[PDB]
Structure formats: structure tokens, C-alpha cells
Design a protein around this nucleic acid. Structure first.
Lengths: 30, 262, 151, 205, 100
RNA sequence: AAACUGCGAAUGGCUCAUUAAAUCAGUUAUGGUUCCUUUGGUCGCUCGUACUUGGAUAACUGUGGUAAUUCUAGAGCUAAUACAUGCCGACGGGCGCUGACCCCCUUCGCGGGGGGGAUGCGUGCAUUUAUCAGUGGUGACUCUAGAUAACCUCGGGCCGAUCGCACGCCGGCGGCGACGACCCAUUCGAACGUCUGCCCUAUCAACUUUCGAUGGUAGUCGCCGUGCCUACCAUGGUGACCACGGGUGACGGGGAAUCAGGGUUCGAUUCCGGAGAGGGAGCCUGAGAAACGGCUACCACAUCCAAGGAAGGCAGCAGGCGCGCAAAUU
């Protein structure tokens, strides 16, 4: 259970960190 | 007192239980559980007093020990178990499912739901923290500890929980324009859309909510439960649909009914 | 030393003063980094606390106390005992048989930090509630405003 | 018995109160553990909520940190010197928190000599031992001796610390409450705090 | 060996009491001559000391070693042990069994 | 049946003696504490006989003592989710320091740079001390999470030698529960503090501070914040806006009677909070008691006795005596 739940948040953490960097990189120039 | 108390007097019981004066001296003291003593409906007052499946408190025990009642998917044989807001009660013998939802008068309603709707519930978010080895942890209004949630979920939000697995399937954030119900205070049982939230640091916030008919009221931020996104609720609603009628309107609506009869 | 007038060495617990860095650091200057916090309810930290050298643990900005509870205001009455002052609060109490009022007062002891210098006994002080600091002290000075005879 | 109530005192105005209830159990106090110097003796005390405390009655060793070097080791406490609270606690040799005590230095002298590859604490009498010289002058490879040589640039200690290493005992402050957790841990004195504490020891004599 | 006794007033002897008289002691759980009724209860009781004197009504005796003659009422009729061991390891120890 | 083990007996019931910013009521805070149980999380995260470990002791049998008690002694057995001890396995490793030896690039070379590495020492969560950098959150942390050097109490810290029901799949694997577990959160609270509020009295005007009174520094003790206590310092703190002292046929509120409007008087009494168990005091057990249908003393009463001793606590339900103008069924 631990290694299946830890490996699914790591995939869902990557998406939420990636979508939160476009919001910053786009805003700096604009 | 030298320790904790184990009794409850009938006049000291929560008024929305609707207990009469002359049945006894005592009232069921709720067991310790996920919901507070003054904000819960024990199983005995629901099986005996509301549904009238039992006539005495001894008959409630006979129904319970046959393992017929499931509270959110688990069999509870305690007859003073503190069920509360948004819980799902399932009686498989008669094929009935109920959800504990306040009505406009501030009392828990007998709200029957479909077997499909009984597979999930909506839970407010009370606490978020980080535990050992950096694992995020939630704590809800149902005393549910759910780890590894989405990082977009914050305090005062609402999540949807699948009762079979206990995992989050979706969530709604707290923002203006979202539907909500009041779960305490003087507007208890009312449904409306959030319009404003005034912040008082070091004290309690205040949220303004407007009904569908145009009536506006305000509550403390701790008494707000986000139901749906926008105007559309995520759960089925009771008969009154959250609109509080005035006493004159209620009188006219009652008098019009008996004229229809004939 | 002025800073070291007590029997026990006075320091800010958060601050470590013995970082052996280089001989040049010894040659350059000996000024300790200072711990100051932002006691925040819209209040601002005085610059005499960020640039001072006093050691007192019951100060809000540079000590181990938390400000929560009630925010009150009063007039300084006495400055006699070490590092704490006595202020006066005046109010009107309503007697409803006569539909009238009467003047009443309360004397309240508060802690005064060294960051609030040049304060005389005539002026308005804002106080914030904290944990019990002594037998009869529960409040702490958060802002000082000069009296009517302001220079 | 010993109570820690607030209603046996006087009011702020100076008026005598009258108690309305008797002594309760959430108000009790216990006799002090005057932790002395000796082989370890610890007694467990059952406390509110069912938990436990450790009354240390004798202590001999403790965990102490050389903060500048970041070197924490077990060390045998030797003697009790100036106390900031009471100067009576030094004649009876009582260990409490924030007390000035003497500790051995050899665990620190070994780490310094094994890390910087320099002799510290050696007297000027040419004391050489084959084990010590194998610690000090053992031949390393090119890269290891390079990494040791680039390290000797900042391997310097103050003049007050190195004098203490001549007599084999350092001055330390116990930062733990030995009568509540049963152990005496702390830090070695340095810098201006050591300068301050070396004055008031001499001012008592 | 002197294994116990009672004095003339029915009071029993205690091993640790180095006295020939009767002393009052505060007894608790795990003490001889006492049996608490509540958890944590202690009671002060009269108990005689272990030194034998002439103020005793009965004296208990246990024969450590067998001599030559046989008492007509002792050693003659041997009572079989009413119960055997329950624990399997104890059964093995008694009957010199093995792992198989 | 009995007995060992676990849990409860700290709730309920009674009464109103004490108590005058005390209790209590509305309002706040714990970022200053503890918490049996319920609910949820966690429970191969640690690199170091197990196909079952050890000794007893009840019930029972037998011999007894005392005038007397829910008094107990000796002897012969026998169990554990009582009391103790103690592994295997996931276990192959991973990650930090130490690091003899080996390889590559460059310079003519010394040299410089980049790698591989045998051999050893540590490692998880709770405990204690010190240092470092800046996942998530607050109005604000000396918060949570992280890193490093160590520590880790024998009166000792967690890491399951426990029990039931259905029986099976390919000698191995197993499905439902029950009982226990350090910790985190939750529920029931409790405990300390914040602001305002109480009757009569000056024929009570100054009070507190030697014997802590107000504050500072460091510590002891305490579940913790604090003169709670100690040592060393300073001389403070309250008062006609009534302090200090005295009285009260004074438990405090929700409330009751009267009533044009204002007002006056009552509230021992079934709901909420407090206090007590003849008067003081001190404790054991336990998550919780300074418990009294628990224990230990002293003071006042009082019970049985073979005179050696033993046993007491109706302001619980009935009931009796006494007191009274004044109050019901063993």
C-alpha cells in the first residue's frame, strides 16, 4: 500500500509543479 | 466533578432533537465519535423517534445487533452512535438510504437518496499539515485523516469521498460564486451562493450569502459548507431547497393546502 | 559591561555567537546578528529593537512572547518599578434606574520594552494580551503615542 | 502536601483571600532532586496522564557539545564551579541547569588531532607515542594529503581554549534539566561568554 | 524448619519482623498476612514477629530430611498428584520427551 | 459454580455549611497544558526454541489458630491476553564519513584536473543536547517538514510468542473478525489565564512589605504559564472613582411574586456552574480523586469483648431520635 500510494502522488505532484511554473514564467515577461 | 460525565438530561439535550418533556428524565448521551455532542443525531433518536421502526429503546438494540444499519458503509451496533452532517445511513433489509441534511428550520431531515448517491459523501477540510518524511495530511469535519492529497486543496474547501475506498475523487475550493449550506448559528439549514468574505485578522471572518429568491444573510466562516460549484449542488437537496419562508408566507402556503383538499 | 549587569550571561537563545570563521572576521568587526520578529497585527517593529543591544526575554519584538487575545489602550500613570509600568483606563458605567453614568477606573500593570525609549507619564499606550509574565502582568506595550503636550 | 496554588498568596492590593476549596491533586509539588556527582542513580516518577519523569540523583558522565567545531561527545563530569543562581549550590556540588562545571577533554582532543592532523594539548616536553605518531604522521596518498593540507589553513583555536587543553579539563555549561529528564547535557563555553565566566570565578576568590 | 505459627490471640508470624512480640504494620499488595479488597488498598494489621517464644498456640513444622524411623501417620500414605501439567514443554520435561 | 485476568466503581443521588472580584454570567485565549474511551491514520521504514521459551500462584485437596471480622498460616498440585524472556523474515541493499590501492585528460616533467574503489564506523520512529539552510501554513513561531554531531535512563521505549469462525488454492500460500500497540489527529472534557458586572457598613481612612508584599535575573518544583518556591538584586503595589477591615437569616445564574410607566422584594429547591461528606490533614491506585457506600493518623462522639483485642461515618432510599410554628411508606 505504501509504495503504490507514494508512487502515485509523485506523478500527481509533478503535474502540479509543472503547471505552476508556466504561470510564473509567462508572467515575468508580461 | 472528578472525571468525565456519562449522563444527559432531557431538557439539556439539543433542541433540534425534538424531545418531549414527559417521556423520561434522561436523554441518550451520544458516544464519543466523529461528530460533536450538540451537532449530531444518535442512532436511537433516528430509528425510533424519526422513522418509527422501533417503539422502545430495547427494540432499537434488537435492530442494531442484527447488523442491519450501515453508517457510511460500516455496521455500527452502538445505539447512541453520533451520526452527523452529510452521513449516509443504509438499511439493506428494506433497501433504504438516507442522508443527514438540515432542513430550513434547523433540524435534520428524513432525506431518502438512491443507492448510487449513497456511494460518496462531501467533507469539509479542517486541517492540513506535513508529517514525518514530508507526507501531506488532511483532517476533515468527519475526523478523517487522508494522506497524499492534491496540493491545490486548502482549508475551508470541500472534497468528495468514495465511501468504499475512502479516497478523494474531486474537490471544490472556497470562492465567491459557489453554492453553500449553513451548518450552524441562526441561518442553519439555509442554502445560498457566496458573494463576499470580509477578513478580520486575529478574529473570525464573515461570509455573505445570497439566496435564490434574493434574500441575503451573513455567517461566520466556520459555519459555511461549500456544496456545489456555482448554482449546481453536488448532492440532492431536501424539500424546501434551502429557502427560509416567513411566518406569513408559511401561513398562506398552509391555508392554501386545506382549501385544495375536498 | 552595560549589557552584562546580571549574574548570568545575557544572550538571545536563537543567536549563536561563537562561529569561528577566520582571523579577518575577528579583525573586521564584532557585532552580533540580532534576532527580531514581526509581531504582526498591522503593528510595526520599532527601529530601536532592530538596532539595539538590550537583552530582555519578555519583549514582543525581540523576545519569547506571543501576542494574542485583546488589544487595549491606556494612559501611563507610573514608571517606577524595573522595566514595567502602571497605566490607567477610565470608563463610564451605566446605572439604569437613574438612566445615568458614573466614572470608574482600572489600574493595569504592563511590561515596557527598552525599544520604547523617551516615554513620559502622560501619554497613550496600546497594549496587547500575552501569557502571564508575572503575578499581576498579562499585557505588553505595542505602540506609544505622545500626549497632548506633544513637542 | 507541597502545593503550588495561587490562592494562599495576597491580592494585588494587598488583601488576604479566603480559600473556597481545599488542596487538589493538580496543584502538587515534589521534593527537589539535588543531583550530586557520582555513579549513575536514577529513579522513575509517575506523573500526570500516566507518564514518567527521571529523577537523576547522581551523575558521572554527560553529552556535551563543542559548538564551534560541531563535536558532541560523552564526557566525564569532574567538578562543580560558579553557579549563577546560588553560590551555596557549589559547596554541596549540586548539578542543575545552567551550571558551570568541569569536563574531560580527551574525546575532543582525539577528534581535533584525527581531523586536522595537528597536535593540540601536547605539552612542550616532546611527548611522542607510537600510536599518537601513527595517528599524526601516518603517510597518506597524494589526494588525501592534499585534502588534509588545504584544511590546515583554518585549523586554529583561541588562546583561552588551548590553555584549558593543557590541564586536560574544559569549562562547560549544562543546558539540560537533570532532575526532570535524568541527564546532564550541554555545551562547552567559548568566546565572550567564557570571558564573562572566567571573571566571576576569579571574583569569588 | 520453623515455617510459621500463630500466637494465643490468633495472629500469624511474619518472617521479616525481628521481634518476639506483636507489631502493627501497614500492609499492601504482595505482603504476607494480608489480602487487599480494592486495587491499591493498604491496611494496618497486627502481626507477630518471627522469633519463636512461649506465646504461641500452634507451631508449623516442615520436615526437611527423612531419618530412620517412620511416623505411623506420615510418609505411609502417598497422595497422587491430583493434576498433571498443562503446558506442553512441561509435559516434555516431566516425561523426558524430545522434539519428535 | 468457584477462582485468576480485564473493566467499572471519579457517573448518578443528597445538601447549601463555607465562600464578597472569591463563586458565577456574557466574551475571549491556550502560539502555555493534559486527556481512559470513540473515530481515522500508522503498525517488513531499523541492515543488527521461532512449528512456541521460563518461574510461579489462585480455585481444589489436606492440617490449623483466635471470644470475636468480608482475619488468615502451613503443606500438596495446576493455567494465562497475569508475571518475565527472547528470536527468525522483509535483508538484497541504499545513504553518509574513513579511505590503502587503480584509471583517464593536460604539461617535457614536478605538478594540476576528473573518476573507480577494497577495508572499517554510523543509520528507523519516540528521548536529550548542540549546529545548519530555507515542503506547507498562520495576523504573528523559537511552527510543521528537512540536514548534521552525538545521546538514549536496568526504577529500562515502540518495533504482536494472544483468541474465535469458515474452510480451502497450488509442503507452501491464504479470508473474515476479537483483544492488545509508542505516536499523530478527532470526540468527551478538564485546568489555567483576558474584558465588564454583586448586598450593608467610615462608631472601618489608610492598607501591604520582618514571615513575598510589586518587579528584575538565574534556577527548583509542577502536566505547563506564572513569587508557585529559592538565591541575589530594586523599592515598589492599592486607595474618597471608597482601598484595607467588619457584617450578611450570603452558594451564583436561568428565574419567581407584585406592577399604568418607572420600580421593590425573593431565588435552600428537580436545569447549568461551585462546594462538601462529623472537624482538620495526609496519601495509594488509576486516564481522571487529595475519593470518603477507599486507606492512614490526630480531635469529638460512639459499637462488640472472655479486658488480650476488633470494628466506625444516612448532607443516598425508607425509617428512628432530637430540634422545633414547621414537612409523607422501614
Amino acid at each position: 500500500k505504501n509504495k503504490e500510494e507514494a508512487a502515485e502522488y509523485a506523478k500527481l505532484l509533478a503535474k502540479r509543479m509543472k503547471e505552476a511554473k508556466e504561470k510564473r514564467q509567462e508572467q515575468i515577461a508580461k | 466533578a472528578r472525571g468525565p460525565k456519562k449522563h444527559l438530561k432531557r431538557v439539556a439535550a439539543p433542541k433540534h432533537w425534538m424531545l418531549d418533556k414527559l417521556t423520561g428524565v434522561f436523554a441518550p448521551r451520544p458516544s464519543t465519535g466523529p461528530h460533536k455532542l450538540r451537532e449530531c443525531l444518535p442512532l436511537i433518536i433516528f430509528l425510533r423517534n424519526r422513522l418509527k421502526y422501533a417503539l422502545t429503546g430495547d427494540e432499537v438494540k434488537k435492530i442494531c445487533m442484527q447488523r442491519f444499519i450501515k453508517i457510511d458503509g460500516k455496521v455500527r451496533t452502538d445505539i447512541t452512535y453520533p451520526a452527523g452532517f452529510m452521513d449516509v445511513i443504509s438499511i439493506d433489509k428494506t433497501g433504504e438510504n438516507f442522508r443527514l441534511i438540515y432542513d430550513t428550520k434547523g433540524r435534520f431531515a428524513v432525506h431518502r437518496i438512491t443507492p448510487e448517491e449513497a456511494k460518496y459523501k462531501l467533507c469539509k477540510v479542517r486541517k492540513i499539515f506535513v508529517g514525518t518524511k514530508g507526507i501531506p495530511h488532511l483532517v476533515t469535519h468527519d475526523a478523517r485523516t487522508i494522506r497524499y492529497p492534491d496540493p491545490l486543496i486548502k482549508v475551508n474547501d470541500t472534497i468528495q469521498i468514495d465511501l468504499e475506498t475512502g479516497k478523494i475523487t474531486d474537490f471544490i475550493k472556497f470562492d465567491t460564486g459557489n453554492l453553500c449550506m449553513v451548518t450552524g448559528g441562526a441561518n442553519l439549514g439555509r442554502i445560498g451562493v457566496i458573494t463576499n468574505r470580509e477578513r478580520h485578522p486575529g478574529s473570525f471572518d464573515v461570509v455573505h450569502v445570497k439566496d435564490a429568491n434574493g434574500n441575503s444573510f451573513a455567517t461566520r466562516l466556520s459555519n459555511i459548507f461549500v456544496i456545489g460549484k456555482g448554482n449546481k449542488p453536488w448532492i440532492s437537496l431536501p424539500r424546501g431547497k434551502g429557502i427560509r419562508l416567513t411566518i406569513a408566507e408559511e401561513r398562506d402556503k398552509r391555508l392554501a393546502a386545506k382549501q385544495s383538499s375536498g | 559591561a552595560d549589557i552584562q549587569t546580571e549574574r548570568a550571561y545575557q544572550k538571545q537563545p536563537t543567536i549563536f555567537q561563537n562561529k569561528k570563521r577566520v582571523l579577518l572576521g575577528e579583525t573586521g568587526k564584532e557585532k552580533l546578528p540580532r534576532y527580531y520578529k514581526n509581531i504582526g497585527l498591522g503593528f510595526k517593529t520599532p527601529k530601536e529593537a532592530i538596532e539595539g543591544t538590550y537583552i530582555d526575554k519578555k519583549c514582543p519584538f525581540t523576545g519569547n512572547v506571543s501576542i494574542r487575545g485583546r488589544i487595549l489602550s491606556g494612559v501611563v500613570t507610573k514608571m517606577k518599578m524595573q522595566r514595567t509600568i502602571v497605566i490607567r483606563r477610565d470608563y463610564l458605567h451605566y446605572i439604569r434606574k437613574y438612566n445615568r453614568f458614573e466614572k470608574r477606573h482600572k489600574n493595569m500593570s504592563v511590561h515596557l520594552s527598552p525599544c520604547f525609549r523617551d516615554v513620559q507619564i502622560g501619554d497613550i499606550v496600546t497594549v496587547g494580551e500575552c501569557r502571564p509574565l508575572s503575578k499581576t502582568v498579562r499585557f505588553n506595550v505595542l505602540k506609544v503615542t505622545k500626549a497632548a503636550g506633544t513637542k | 502536601g507541597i502545593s503550588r496554588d495561587n490562592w494562599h498568596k495576597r491580592r494585588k492590593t494587598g488583601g488576604k483571600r479566603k480559600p473556597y476549596h481545599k488542596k487538589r491533586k493538580y496543584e502538587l509539588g515534589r521534593p527537589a532532586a539535588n543531583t550530586k556527582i557520582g555513579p549513575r542513580r536514577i529513579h522513575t516518577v509517575r506523573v500526570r496522564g500516566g507518564n514518567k519523569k527521571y529523577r537523576a540523583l547522581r551523575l558521572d558522565v554527560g553529552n556535551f557539545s563543542w559548538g564551534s567545531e560541531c563535536c558532541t561527545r560523552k564526557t566525564r563530569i569532574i567538578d562543580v564551579v560558579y553557579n549563577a543562581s546560588n553560590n551555596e549550590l557549589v559547596r554541596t556540588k549540586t548539578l542543575v541547569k545552567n551550571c558551570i562545571v568541569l569536563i574531560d577533554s580527551t574525546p575532543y582532543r582525539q577528534w581535533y588531532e584525527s581531523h586536522y592532523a595537528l597536535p593540540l594539548g601536547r605539552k612542550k616536553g616532546a611527548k611522542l607515542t607510537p600510536e599518537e605518531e601513527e595517528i599524526l604522521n601516518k603517510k597518506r596518498s597524494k589526494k588525501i594529503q592534499k585534502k588534509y593540507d588545504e584544511r590546515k589553513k583554518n585549523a586554529k583555536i583561541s588562546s583561552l581554549l588551548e590553555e584549558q587543553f593543557q590541564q586536560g579539563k574544559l569549562l562547560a555549561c549544562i543546558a539540560s534539566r537533570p532532575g526532570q529528564c535524568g541527564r546532564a547535557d550541554g555545551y562547552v563555553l567559548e568566546g565572550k561568554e567564557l570571558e564573562f565566566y572566567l571573571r566571576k570565578i576569579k571574583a569569588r576568590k | 524448619r520453623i515455617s510459621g505459627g500463630n500466637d494465643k490471640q490468633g495472629f500469624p508470624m511474619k518472617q521479616g519482623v525481628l521481634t518476639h512480640g506483636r507489631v502493627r504494620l501497614l500492609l499492601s499488595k504482595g505482603h504476607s498476612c494480608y489480602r487487599p479488597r480494592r486495587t491499591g488498598e493498604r491496611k494496618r494489621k497486627s502481626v507477630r514477629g518471627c522469633i519463636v517464644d512461649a506465646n504461641l498456640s500452634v507451631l508449623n513444622l516442615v520436615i526437611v530430611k527423612k531419618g530412620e524411623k517412620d511416623i505411623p501417620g506420615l510418609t505411609d500414605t502417598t497422595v497422587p498428584r491430583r493434576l498433571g501439567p498443562k503446558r506442553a514443554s512441561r509435559i516434555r520435561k516431566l516425561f523426558n520427551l524430545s522434539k519428535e
